[PDB]
Coordinates of C-alpha atoms in Angstrom, one line a residue:
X1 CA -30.7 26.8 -31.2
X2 CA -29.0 24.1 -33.0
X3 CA -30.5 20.0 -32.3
X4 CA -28.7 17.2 -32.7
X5 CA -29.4 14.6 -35.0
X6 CA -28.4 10.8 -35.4
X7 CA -29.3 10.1 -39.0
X8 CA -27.9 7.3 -41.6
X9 CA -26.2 7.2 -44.8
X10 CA -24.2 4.4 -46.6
X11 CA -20.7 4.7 -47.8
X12 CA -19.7 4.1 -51.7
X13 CA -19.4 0.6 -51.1
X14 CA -22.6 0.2 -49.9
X15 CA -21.8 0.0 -46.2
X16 CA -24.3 1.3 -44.1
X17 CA -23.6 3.7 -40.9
X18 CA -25.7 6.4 -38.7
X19 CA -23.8 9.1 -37.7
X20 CA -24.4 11.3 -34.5
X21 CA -23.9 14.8 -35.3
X22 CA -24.1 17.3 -32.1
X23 CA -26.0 20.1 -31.8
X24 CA -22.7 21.9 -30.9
X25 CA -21.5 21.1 -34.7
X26 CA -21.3 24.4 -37.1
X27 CA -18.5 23.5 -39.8
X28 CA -16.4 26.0 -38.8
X29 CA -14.3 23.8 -36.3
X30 CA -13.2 20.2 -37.4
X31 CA -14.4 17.8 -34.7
X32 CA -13.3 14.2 -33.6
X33 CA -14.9 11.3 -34.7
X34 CA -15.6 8.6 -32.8
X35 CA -16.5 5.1 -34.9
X36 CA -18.1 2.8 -32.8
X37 CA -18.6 -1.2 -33.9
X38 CA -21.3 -2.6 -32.7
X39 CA -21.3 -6.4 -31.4
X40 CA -22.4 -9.8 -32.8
X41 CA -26.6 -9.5 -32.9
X42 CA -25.8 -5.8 -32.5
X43 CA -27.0 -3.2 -35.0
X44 CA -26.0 0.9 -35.0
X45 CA -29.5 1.9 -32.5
X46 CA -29.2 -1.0 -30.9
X47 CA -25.4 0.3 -29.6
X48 CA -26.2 4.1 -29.7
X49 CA -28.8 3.1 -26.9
X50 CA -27.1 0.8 -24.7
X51 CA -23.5 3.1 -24.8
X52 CA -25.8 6.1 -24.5
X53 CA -22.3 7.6 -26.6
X54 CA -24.1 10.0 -28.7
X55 CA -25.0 11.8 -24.8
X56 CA -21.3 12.1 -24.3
X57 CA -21.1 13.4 -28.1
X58 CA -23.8 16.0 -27.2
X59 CA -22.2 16.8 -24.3
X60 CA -18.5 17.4 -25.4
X61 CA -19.1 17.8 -29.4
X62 CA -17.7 15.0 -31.0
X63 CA -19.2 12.6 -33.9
X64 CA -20.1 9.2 -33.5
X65 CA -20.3 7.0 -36.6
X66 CA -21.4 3.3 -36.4
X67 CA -21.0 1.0 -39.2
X68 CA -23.4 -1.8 -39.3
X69 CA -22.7 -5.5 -39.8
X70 CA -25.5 -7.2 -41.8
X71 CA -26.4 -10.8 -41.5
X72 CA -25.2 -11.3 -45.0
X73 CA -21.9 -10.8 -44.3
X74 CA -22.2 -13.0 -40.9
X75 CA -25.4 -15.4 -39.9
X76 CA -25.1 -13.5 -36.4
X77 CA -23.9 -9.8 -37.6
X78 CA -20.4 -10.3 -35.7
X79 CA -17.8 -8.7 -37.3
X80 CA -15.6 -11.5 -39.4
X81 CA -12.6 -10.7 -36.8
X82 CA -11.5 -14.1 -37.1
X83 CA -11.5 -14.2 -41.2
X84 CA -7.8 -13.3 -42.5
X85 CA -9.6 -11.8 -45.2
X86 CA -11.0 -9.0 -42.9
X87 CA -7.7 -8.3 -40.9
X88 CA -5.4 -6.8 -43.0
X89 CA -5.2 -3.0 -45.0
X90 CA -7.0 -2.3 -48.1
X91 CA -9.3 -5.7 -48.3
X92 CA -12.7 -6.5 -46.6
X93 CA -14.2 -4.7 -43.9
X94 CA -11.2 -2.9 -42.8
X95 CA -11.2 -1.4 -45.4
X96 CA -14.7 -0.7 -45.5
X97 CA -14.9 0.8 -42.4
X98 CA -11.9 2.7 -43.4
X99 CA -14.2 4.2 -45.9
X100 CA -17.0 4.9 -43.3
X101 CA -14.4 7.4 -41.8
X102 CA -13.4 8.8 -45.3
X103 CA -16.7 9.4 -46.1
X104 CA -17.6 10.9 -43.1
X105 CA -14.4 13.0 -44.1
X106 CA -15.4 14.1 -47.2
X107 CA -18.8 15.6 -46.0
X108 CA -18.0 16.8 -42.3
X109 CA -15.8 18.9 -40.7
X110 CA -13.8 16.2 -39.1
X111 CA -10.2 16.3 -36.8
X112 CA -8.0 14.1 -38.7
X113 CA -6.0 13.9 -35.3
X114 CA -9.3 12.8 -33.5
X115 CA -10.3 9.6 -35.3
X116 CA -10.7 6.9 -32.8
X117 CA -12.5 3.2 -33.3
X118 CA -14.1 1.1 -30.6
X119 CA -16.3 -1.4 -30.1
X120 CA -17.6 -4.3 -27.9
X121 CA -17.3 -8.1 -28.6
X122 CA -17.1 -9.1 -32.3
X123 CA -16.5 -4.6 -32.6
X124 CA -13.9 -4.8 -30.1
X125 CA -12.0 -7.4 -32.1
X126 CA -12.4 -5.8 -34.9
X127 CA -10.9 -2.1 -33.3
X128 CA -7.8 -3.6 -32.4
X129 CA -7.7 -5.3 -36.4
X130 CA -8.7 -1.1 -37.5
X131 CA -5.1 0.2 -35.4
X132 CA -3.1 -2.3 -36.6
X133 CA -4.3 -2.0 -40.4
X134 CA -5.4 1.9 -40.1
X135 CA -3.1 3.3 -37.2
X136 CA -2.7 6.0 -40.0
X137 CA -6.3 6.9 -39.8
X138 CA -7.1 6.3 -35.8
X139 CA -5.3 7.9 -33.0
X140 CA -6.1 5.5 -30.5
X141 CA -8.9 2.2 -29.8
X142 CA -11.3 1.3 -27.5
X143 CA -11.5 -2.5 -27.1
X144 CA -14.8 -3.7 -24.8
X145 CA -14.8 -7.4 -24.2
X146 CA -12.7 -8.1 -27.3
X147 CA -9.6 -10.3 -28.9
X148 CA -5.7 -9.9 -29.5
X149 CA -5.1 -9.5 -33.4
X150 CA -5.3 -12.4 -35.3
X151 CA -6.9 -14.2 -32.0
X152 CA -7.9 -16.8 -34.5
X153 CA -7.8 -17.2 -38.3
X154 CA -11.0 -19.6 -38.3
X155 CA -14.1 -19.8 -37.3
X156 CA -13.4 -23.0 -35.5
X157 CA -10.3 -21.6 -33.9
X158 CA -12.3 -18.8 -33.1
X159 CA -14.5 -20.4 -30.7
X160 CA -11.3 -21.9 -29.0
X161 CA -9.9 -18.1 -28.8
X162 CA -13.1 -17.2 -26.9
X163 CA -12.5 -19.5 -24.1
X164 CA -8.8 -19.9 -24.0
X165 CA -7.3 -16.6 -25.7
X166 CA -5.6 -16.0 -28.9
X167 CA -1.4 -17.1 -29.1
X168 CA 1.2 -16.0 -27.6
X169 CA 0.4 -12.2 -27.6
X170 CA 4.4 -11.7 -28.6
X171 CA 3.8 -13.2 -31.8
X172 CA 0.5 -11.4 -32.3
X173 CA 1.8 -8.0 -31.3
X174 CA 4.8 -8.8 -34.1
X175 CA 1.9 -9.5 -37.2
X176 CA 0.2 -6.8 -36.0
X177 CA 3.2 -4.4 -36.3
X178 CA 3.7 -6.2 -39.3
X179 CA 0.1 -5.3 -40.5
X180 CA 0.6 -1.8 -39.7
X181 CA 3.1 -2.0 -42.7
X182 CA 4.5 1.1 -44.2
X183 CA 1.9 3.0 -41.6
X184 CA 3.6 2.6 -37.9
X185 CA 3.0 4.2 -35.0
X186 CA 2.3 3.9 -31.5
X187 CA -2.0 3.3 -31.2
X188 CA -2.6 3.8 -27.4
X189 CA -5.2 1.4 -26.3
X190 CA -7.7 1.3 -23.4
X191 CA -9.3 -1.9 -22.6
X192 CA -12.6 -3.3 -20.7
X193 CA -12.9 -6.8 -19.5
X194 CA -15.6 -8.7 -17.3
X195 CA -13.6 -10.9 -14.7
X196 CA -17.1 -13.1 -15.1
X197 CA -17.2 -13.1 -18.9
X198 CA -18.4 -17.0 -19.9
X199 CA -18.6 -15.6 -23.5
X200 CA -15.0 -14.1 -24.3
X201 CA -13.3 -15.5 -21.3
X202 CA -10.7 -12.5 -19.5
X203 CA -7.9 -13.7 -20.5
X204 CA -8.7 -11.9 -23.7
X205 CA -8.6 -8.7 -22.2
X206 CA -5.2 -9.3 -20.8
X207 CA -3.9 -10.4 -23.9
X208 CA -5.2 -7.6 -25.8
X209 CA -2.7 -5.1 -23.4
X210 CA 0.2 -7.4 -24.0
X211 CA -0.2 -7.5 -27.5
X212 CA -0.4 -4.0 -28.0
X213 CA 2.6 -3.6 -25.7
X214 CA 4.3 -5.9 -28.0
X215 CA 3.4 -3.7 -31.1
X216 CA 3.5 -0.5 -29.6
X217 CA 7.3 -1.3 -28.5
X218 CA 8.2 -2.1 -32.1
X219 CA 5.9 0.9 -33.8
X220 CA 7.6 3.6 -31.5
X221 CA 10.1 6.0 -32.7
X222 CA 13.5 5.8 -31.7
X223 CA 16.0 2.3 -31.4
X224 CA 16.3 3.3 -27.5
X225 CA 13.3 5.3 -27.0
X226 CA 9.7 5.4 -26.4
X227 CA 9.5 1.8 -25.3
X228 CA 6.9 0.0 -23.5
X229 CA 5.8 -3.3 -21.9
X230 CA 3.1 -4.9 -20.1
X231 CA 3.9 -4.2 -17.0
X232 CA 1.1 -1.9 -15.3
X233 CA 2.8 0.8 -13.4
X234 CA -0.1 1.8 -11.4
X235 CA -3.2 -0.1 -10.5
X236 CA -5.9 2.1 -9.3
X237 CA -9.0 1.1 -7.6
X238 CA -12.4 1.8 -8.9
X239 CA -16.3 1.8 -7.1
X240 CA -19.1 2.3 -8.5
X241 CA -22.0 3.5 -5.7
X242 CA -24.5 0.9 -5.6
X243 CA -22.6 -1.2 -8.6
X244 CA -19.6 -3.3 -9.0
X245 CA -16.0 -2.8 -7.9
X246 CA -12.8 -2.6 -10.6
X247 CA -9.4 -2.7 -10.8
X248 CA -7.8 0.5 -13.3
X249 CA -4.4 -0.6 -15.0
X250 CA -2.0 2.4 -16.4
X251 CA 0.5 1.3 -18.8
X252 CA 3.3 4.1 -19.3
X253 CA 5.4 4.3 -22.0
X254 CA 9.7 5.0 -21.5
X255 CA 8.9 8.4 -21.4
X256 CA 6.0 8.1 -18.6
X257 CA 3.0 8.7 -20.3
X258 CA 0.4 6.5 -20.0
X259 CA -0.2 5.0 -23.3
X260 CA -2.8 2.2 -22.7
X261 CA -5.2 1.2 -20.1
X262 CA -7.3 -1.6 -18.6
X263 CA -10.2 -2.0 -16.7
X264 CA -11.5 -5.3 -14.9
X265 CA -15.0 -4.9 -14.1
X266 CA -15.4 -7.5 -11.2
X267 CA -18.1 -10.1 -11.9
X268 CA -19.4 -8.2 -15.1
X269 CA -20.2 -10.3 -17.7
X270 CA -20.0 -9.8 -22.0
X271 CA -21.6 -6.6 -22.1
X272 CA -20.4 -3.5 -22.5
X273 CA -19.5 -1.3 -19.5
X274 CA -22.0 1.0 -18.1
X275 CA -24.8 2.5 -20.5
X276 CA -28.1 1.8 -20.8
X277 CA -30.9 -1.4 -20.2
X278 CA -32.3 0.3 -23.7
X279 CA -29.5 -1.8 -25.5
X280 CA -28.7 -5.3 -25.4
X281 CA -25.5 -6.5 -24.2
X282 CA -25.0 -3.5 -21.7
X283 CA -24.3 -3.9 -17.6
X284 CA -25.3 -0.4 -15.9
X285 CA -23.9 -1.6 -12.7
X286 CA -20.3 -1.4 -14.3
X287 CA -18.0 2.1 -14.4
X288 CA -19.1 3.9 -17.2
X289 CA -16.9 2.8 -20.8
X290 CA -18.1 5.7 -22.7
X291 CA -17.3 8.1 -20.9
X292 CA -13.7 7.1 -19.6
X293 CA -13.2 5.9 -23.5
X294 CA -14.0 9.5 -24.4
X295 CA -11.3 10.4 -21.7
X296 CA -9.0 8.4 -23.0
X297 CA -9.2 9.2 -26.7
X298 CA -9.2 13.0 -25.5
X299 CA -6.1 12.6 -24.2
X300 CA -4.6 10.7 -26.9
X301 CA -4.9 12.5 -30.5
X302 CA -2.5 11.5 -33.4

């Protein structure tokens, strides 16, 4: 029977990106696509092994595709989150990653309802700058230890942002509905944060959910419909046996469906959620990010 394979290719601009493609993958039924962003130091194999997400693609047939951030485009391969010229449509590596996803769309059998982008640290930053710029393209982010869009606009604001969070996440969630331009629409959002994160301090996370409540209120249809805040309207406990405690935040929209989510990992650092000691940057003692991003996105197609 079919294997599957995790091979590379680069994009017509030159940008590099391995692609999982499951064994359950034939042609003859479009699947989602996952694009996952590595973090700062971070390369595609280095992130396929600590999220161990190309397991959950095997499992439920989805593609993964990771775009890689080369040390020429930042000394420490962190996505330029923090660079205006790489956080708006059609310039830089939005649109570069953008193209990842086209070109993956031109030679794959892809669900263009089933697009989603995450990514941890530098990646996670740089997912919530893909649904503000591309909420035409992805149905909804994953953000693992990220930023609000536009946390900073540079690099010595940046390092501020890390420790003391981005502005007001009003403002931001208005210039990111403004980046979405002539694209709108709702971009549900599921969050992870370490409540011991000394690198990209927590209050990150938190302002990440309020400034997507901010722009999902303004991207939804309807003047007196399909609004949302930042108020969690349930807050479920989570355990992992033998690991750490979290706290689960649902966010529900007017209409009650929960459009974004956010999970505290308690004492986890910056690394991502779960996964693997084969990958840097990864805390197995924490719930398990891949898979409950996969959830997520599942339940949340264009």
């Amino acid at each position: 029977g079919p294997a599957g394979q995790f091979i590379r290719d680069t994009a017509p601009d030159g940008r590099v990106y391995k692609l999982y493609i499951p064994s359950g993958y034939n042609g003859s039924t479009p699947l989602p696509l996952v694009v996952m962003l590595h973090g700062c130091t971070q390369n595609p194999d280095d992130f396929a092994a600590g999220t161990e997400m190309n397991v959950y693609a095997e499992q439920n047939n989805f593609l993964v595709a990771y775009p890689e951030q080369p040390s020429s485009a930042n000394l420490n391969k962190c996505w330029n989150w923090f660079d205006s010229n790489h956080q708006s449509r059609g310039r830089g590596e939005p649109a570069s990653i953008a193209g990842v996803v086209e070109d993956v769309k031109r030679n794959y059998s892809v669900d263009s309802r089933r697009v989603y982008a995450a990514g941890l640290s530098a990646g996670g930053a740089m997912s919530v700058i893909m649904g503000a710029t591309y909420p035409d393209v992805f149905a909804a982010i994953g953000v693992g230890s990220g930023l609000e869009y536009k946390a900073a606009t540079s690099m010595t604001s940046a390092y501020m942002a890390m420790i003391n969070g981005g502005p007001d996440p009003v403002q931001q969630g208005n210039l990111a509905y403004q980046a979405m331009g002539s694209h709108a629409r709702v971009v549900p959002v599921i969050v992870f944060h370490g409540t011991s994160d000394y690198t990209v301090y927590p209050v990150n996370g938190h302002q990440v959910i309020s400034q997507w409540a901010q722009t999902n209120d303004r991207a939804g249809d309807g003047v007196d419909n399909n609004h949302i805040d930042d108020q969690a309207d349930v807050t479920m406990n989570g355990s992992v046996p033998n690991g750490r405690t979290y706290t689960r935040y649902l966010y529900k929209d007017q209409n009650g469906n929960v459009v974004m989510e956010k999970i505290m990992v308690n004492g986890m650092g910056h690394a991502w959620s779960g996964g693997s000691t084969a990958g840097t940057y990864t805390d197995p003692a924490g719930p398990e990010a891949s898979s409950m991003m996969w959830s997520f996105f599942v339940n949340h197609p264009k």
